[PDB]
């Protein structure tokens, strides 16, 4: 009775059942959750001025965009050799949080995370924030499992060290930051 | 028979050249101005880490929230970018004035002891890009022919 | 000495001049935009007699490109033949040379404009791009699998950026970059496709091509570039021959179009027919992106909203804009015969032949002239809207029926085979978009075709076309939901579902998936 | 014609941060605060 052919309902139900066994990242009959393509589709502002590449997951940072800055600010062809070498141990806390948040998905984010970790800052896996002990503020409640006292947490949305006295699990707290010795890494080839 | 043979030899050739091209895909750096100090170094970072920077961290207002050291870092190590223009912008707003000859930002510590139509001499705080730090200077002559 | 009829000792001469410039470009106080160095380098060029003939000038450009290409290939070899070598420093080596070359080109061009010239200045820009395209394609063809795209990718972008920092001169620059991109379309240069999509979709290039373009002059040119991308992808998407590199290219296509859908929805709206003629009928979502674009600042009722009366909408009488002259696909005798049928409703030999005229069993593996099915459907409908408008009425469920137009549509539903009918129905569905007089016409057509179906097969295929398009992830065209919601309400369908749904209880799941995928 | 060539041929007819930093040491008294 039904269309015994590929151009009927049976034809379609066959494609849907095929996605189960198809290991591809493209399923033409079912589509992709387009929100997950790393594009701010809700944004009231245009996407194109910050559109990185067709393969990138995050938009253009201001270090990425080039600007025709006043001639005078092009200081390197002049200070190059006398200019200090980059040493994250030399830099302060504010520059480290800048280096961390801005260089997301780069070795620099981990390099800043390492120097912060060397300064008693510990990253929370669950709450996605950096936390450190306040001056002499030892925890009121103290065990091997967790600690309850007053802690400075870095709120990036207001860009400042914030006092917040609440319970923190030692497990949900990130260990010493890793470094990937991944040769010729390209995030575009895996997408 | 082999389904891929539905493609023409030209289409197979096309696919082959594309497959090859995939092994050496363009790197973000390829279509960008050389970054002498902070080149791109993509790496596998965990999902629980900040994959993307905070929203509206591209405004002169956000840049005003940063430390002077941060702004001085962006100015020297991120030359000729929107970030360098925004940092110099916030710096300028934060009452710092770039000396073109010395290639350093100066800020008045006191009121200048002398102000002429050509210069101003007083005690200023400046940023040493080699010693990487703030340094005070007494009896400094800021020639306006180097100011702007 | 080179492959070319290159004068003796010219490669040696050119490579010495470039070597110098690369050190000059990187030298201190060489000028803010290599000005102090360039004025002096042009002298050195002139002295070395490369400035004598235009033929030698062009030859110097070819040799410079090949040098830069070779430097890259070597840089790439040391990165591999030494895995202890810094890959970031390798990249820097190529960039060192390529950025330098780009500035020589950019300066040779901006300074070629003698007494503020436009023609000479542009003609050299064309010459340079042409010389680079030549080196690319030969490299591409000889190196095959080992072809590296980096030199060309950096040359093309940096030159576009250098020449962006003269609003008319800006357009002829863009028109020059466009022709290049078209010449280097992936069907010509497949090994450059990733760099090509990166060029085509650059922040600056979209900006200049679509937003900051006079009287939207860039819109047809950009639309060509996208057609080139869809023309390329089409055999692979059609065949479901999707390798990891193809999945990566397809996902990039999705990201580009999502950006276009969001920023320039009127662009996608205008060129929707053109894009639909090249995207294979199986790419549901990709096509939905095009078919979901609607003029900005336009209220679109929620298709679900209870007791929604679509006729009320003042928009349903206004026709959409079509910037693809679709009538063209039609062979002049065919359109002549067709127009005779539409007014005279004679001869009946037209309908019988029509089915055969749409067949292209000449060409292998298709047996159907898809592009022609699309043109007939859109044309017949548009002619039908005009005919009803002329009669003083408006396209309605009643005014669209029993016209010479509907006789063609009704015949195609009955007289085509499952494949034929599938293509035909898809051609109707591609018009179910935002509230407009084509959406309304074809929505009624589709609904009437289901209702007047004497075959179960006709009913299943209508259901399949609408459902396959709604079962997929968002976006879903307004008109599509409207058409479907009105169909699921007809006793014709109620009866059809009742019969099919118990012969295949798995089918029940699909219809239930639409209630949540969209609502 | 060699129109391009002549435009560049006729164009051809036309046309220390150590000493600065050492002069910076002499321009005032450096300190720490």
UniProtKB/Swiss-Prot annotation, chain A:
GO terms for cellular component: CCR4-NOT complex; CCR4-NOT core complex; cytoplasm; cytosol; membrane; nucleoplasm; nucleus; P-body. GO terms for molecular function: transcription coregulator activity; transcription corepressor binding. Keywords: Cytoplasm, Developmental protein, Disease variant, Intellectual disability, Nucleus, Phosphoprotein, Repressor, RNA-mediated gene silencing, Transcription, Transcription regulation, Translation regulation. It is found in: Cytoplasm; Nucleus. Residues 89-191 are annotated as: Repressor domain. Component of the CCR4-NOT complex which is one of the major cellular mRNA deadenylases and is linked to various cellular processes including bulk mRNA degradation, miRNA-mediated repression, translational repression during translational initiation and general transcription regulation. Additional complex functions may be a consequence of its influence on mRNA expression. Required for the CCR4-NOT complex structural integrity. It is linked to Intellectual developmental disorder with nasal speech, dysmorphic facies, and variable skeletal anomalies: An autosomal dominant disorder characterized by delayed development, speech delay with nasal speech, and characteristic facial features including upslanted palpebral fissures, anteverted nares, a thin upper lip, and micrognathia. Some patients may have skeletal anomalies, such as brachydactyly, toe syndactyly and flat feet. Belongs to the CNOT2/3/5 family. This is CCR4-NOT transcription complex subunit 2. The lineage of its organism: Eukaryota, Metazoa, Chordata, Craniata, Vertebrata. The chain holds residues 350 to 539 of 540 of the full protein.
Swiss-Prot record, chain B:
Residues 61-148 are annotated as: Repressor domain. Ubiquitous. Highly expressed in brain, heart, thymus, spleen, kidney, liver, small intestine, lung and peripheral blood leukocytes. Transmembrane segments: none annotated. It is found in: Cytoplasm; Nucleus; Cytoplasm, P-body. Changing residue 97 to Q: In IDDSADF; uncertain significance. It is linked to Intellectual developmental disorder with speech delay, autism and dysmorphic facies: An autosomal dominant disorder characterized by mild to severe intellectual disability, developmental delay, delayed or absent speech, hypotonia, short stature, autistic features, and highly variable dysmorphic facial features. Component of the CCR4-NOT complex which is one of the major cellular mRNA deadenylases and is linked to various cellular processes including bulk mRNA degradation, miRNA-mediated repression, translational repression during translational initiation and general transcription regulation. Additional complex functions may be a consequence of its influence on mRNA expression. May be involved in metabolic regulation; may be involved in recruitment of the CCR4-NOT complex to deadenylation target mRNAs involved in energy metabolism. Belongs to the CNOT2/3/5 family. Component of the CCR4-NOT complex; distinct complexes seem to exist that differ in the participation of probably mutually exclusive catalytic subunits. In the complex interacts directly with CNOT2. Interacts with TIP120B and NANOS2. Interacts with EBF1. Interacts in an RNA-independent manner with BICC1 (via KH domains). This is CCR4-NOT transcription complex subunit 3. It comes from Homo sapiens. The gene is CNOT3.
From Swiss-Prot, chain C:
It is linked to Holoprosencephaly 12 with or without pancreatic agenesis: An autosomal dominant form of holoprosencephaly, a structural anomaly of the brain in which the developing forebrain fails to correctly separate into right and left hemispheres. Holoprosencephaly is genetically heterogeneous and associated with several distinct facies and phenotypic variability. Vissers-Bodmer syndrome: An autosomal dominant disorder characterized by global developmental delay, intellectual disability of varying degree, speech delay, motor delay, and hypotonia. Abnormal growth, and cerebral, skeletal, muscle and soft tissue abnormalities are frequently observed. Many patients have behavioral problems, including anxiety, obsessive compulsive disorder, autism spectrum disorder and attention deficit-hyperactivity disorder. Strongly expressed in brain, heart, thymus, spleen, kidney, liver, placenta and lung. Weakly expressed in skeletal muscle and colon. It comes from the Eukaryota. A motif (LXXLL) lies at residues 104-108, 254-258. It is found in: Cytoplasm, P-body; Nucleus. This is CCR4-NOT transcription complex subunit 1. Contains Leu-Xaa-Xaa-Leu-Leu (LXXLL) motifs, a motif known to be important for the association with nuclear receptors. Belongs to the CNOT1 family. The chain holds residues 1839 to 2361 of 2376 of the full protein.
């Amino acid at each position: 009775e039904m269309v015994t052919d590929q151009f009927g309902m049976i034809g379609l139900l066959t494609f849907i059942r095929a996605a189960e066994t198809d290991p591809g990242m493209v399923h033409l009959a079912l589509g992709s959750d387009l929100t997950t393509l790393g594009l701010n589709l809700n944004s009231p502002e245009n996407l194109y001025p910050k559109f990185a590449s067709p393969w990138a997951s995050s938009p253009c940072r201001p270090q990425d965009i080039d600007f025709h800055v006043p001639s005078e600010y092009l200081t390197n062809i002049h200070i190059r050799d006398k200019l200090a070498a980059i040493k994250l141990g030399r830099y302060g806390e504010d520059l480290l949080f800048y280096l961390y948040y801005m260089n997301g998905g780069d070795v620099l984010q981990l390099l800043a995370a390492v120097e912060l970790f060397n300064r008693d800052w510990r990253y929370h896996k669950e709450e996605r924030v950096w936390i450190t002990r306040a001056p002499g503020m030892e925890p009121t409640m103290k065990t091997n499992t967790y600690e309850r006292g007053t802690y400075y947490f870095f709120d990036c949305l207001n860009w400042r060290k914030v006092a917040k006295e609440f319970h923190l699990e030692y497990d949900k707290l990130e260990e010493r930051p890793h470094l990937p010795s991944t040769f010729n890494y390209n995030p575009a080839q895996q997408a | 028979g082999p389904h891929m043979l539905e493609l023409t030899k030209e289409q197979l050739y096309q696919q082959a050249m594309e497959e090859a091209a995939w092994h050496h895909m363009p790197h973000p750096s390829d279509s960008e101005r050389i970054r002498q100090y902070l080149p791109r170094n993509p790496c596998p970072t965990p999902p629980y880490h900040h994959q993307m920077p905070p929203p509206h961290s591209d405004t002169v207002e956000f840049y005003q929230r940063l430390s002077t050291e941060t702004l001085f870092f962006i100015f020297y190590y991120l030359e000729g970018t929107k970030a360098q223009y925004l940092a110099a912008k916030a710096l300028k707003k934060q009452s710092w004035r770039f000396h073109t000859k010395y290639m350093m930002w100066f800020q008045r510590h006191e009121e200048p002891k002398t102000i002429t139509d050509e210069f101003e001499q007083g005690t200023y705080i400046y940023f040493d890009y080699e010693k990487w730090g703030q340094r005070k200077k007494e009896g400094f002559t800021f020639e306006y022919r180097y100011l702007e | 000495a080179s492959e070319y009829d290159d004068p003796p000792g010219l490669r040696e001469k050119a490579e010495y001049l470039l070597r110098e410039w690369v050190n000059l470009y990187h030298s201190a106080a060489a000028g803010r935009d290599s000005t102090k160095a360039f004025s002096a380098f042009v002298g050195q060029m002139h002295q070395q007699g490369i400035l004598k003939t235009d033929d030698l000038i062009t030859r110097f450009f070819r040799l410079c490109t090949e040098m830069c290409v070779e430097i890259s290939y070597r840089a790439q070899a040391e990165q591999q033949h030494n895995p202890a070598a810094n890959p970031t420093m390798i990249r820097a080596k190529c960039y060192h040379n390529l950025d330098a070359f780009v500035r020589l080109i950019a300066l040779l061009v901006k300074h070629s404009g003698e007494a503020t010239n436009t023609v000479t200045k542009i003609n050299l820009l064309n010459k340079v791009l042409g010389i680079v395209v030549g080196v690319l394609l030969q490299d591409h063809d000889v190196r095959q699998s080992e072809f590296q795209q980096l030199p060309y990718h950096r040359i093309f972008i940096m030159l576009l950026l250098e020449l962006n920092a003269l609003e008319t001169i800006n357009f002829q620059t863009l028109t020059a970059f466009c022709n290049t991109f078209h010449i280097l379309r992936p069907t010509k240069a497949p090994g450059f496709v990733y760099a090509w999509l990166e060029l085509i979709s650059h922040r600056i290039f979209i900006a200049r091509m679509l937003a900051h373009t006079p009287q939207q002059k860039g819109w047809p040119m950009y639309a060509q570039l996208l057609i080139d991308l869809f023309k390329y992808l089409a055999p692979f998407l059609r065949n479901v021959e999707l390798t990891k590199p193809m999945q990566i290219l397809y996902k990039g296509t999705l990201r580009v179009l999502l950006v276009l859908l969001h920023d320039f929805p009127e662009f996608l709206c205008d060129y929707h027919y053109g894009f639909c003629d090249v995207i294979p009928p199986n790419c549901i979502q990709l096509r939905n992106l095009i078919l979901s674009a609607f003029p900005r600042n336009m209220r679109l009722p929620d298709p679900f909203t209870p007791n929604l009366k679509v006729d009320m909408l003042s928009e349903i009488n206004i026709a959409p804009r079509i910037l693809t002259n679709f009538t063209g696909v039609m062979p002049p005798q065919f359109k002549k015969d067709l127009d005779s049928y539409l007014k005279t409703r004679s001869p009946v030999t037209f309908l019988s032949d029509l089915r055969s005229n749409l067949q292209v069993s000449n060409e292998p593996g298709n047996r159907y002239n898809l592009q022609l099915i699309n043109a007939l459907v859109l044309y017949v409908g548009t002619q039908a809207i005009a005919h009803i408008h002329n009669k003083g009425s408006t396209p309605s469920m009643s005014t669209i029926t029993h016209s010479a137009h509907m006789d063609i549509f009704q015949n195609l539903a009955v007289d085509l085979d499952t494949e034929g009918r599938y293509l035909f129905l898809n051609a109707i569905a591609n018009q179910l978009r935002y509230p407009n007089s084509h959406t309304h016409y074809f929505s009624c057509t589709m609904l009437y075709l289901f209702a007047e179906a004497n075959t179960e097969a006709i009913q299943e295929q209508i259901t399949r076309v609408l459902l396959e398009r709604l079962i997929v992830n968002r976006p879903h065209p307004w008109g599509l939901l409207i058409t479907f919601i009105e169909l699921i309400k007809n006793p014709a369908f109620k009866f059809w579902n009742h019969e099919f749904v118990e012969e295949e209880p798995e089918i029940e799941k699909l219809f239930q998936s639409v209630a949540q995928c969209c609502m | 014609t060699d129109e391009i060539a002549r435009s560049l041929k006729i164009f051809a007819q036309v046309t220390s941060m150590q000493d600065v930093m050492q002069e910076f040491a002499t321009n005032g008294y450096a300190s720490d605060d």
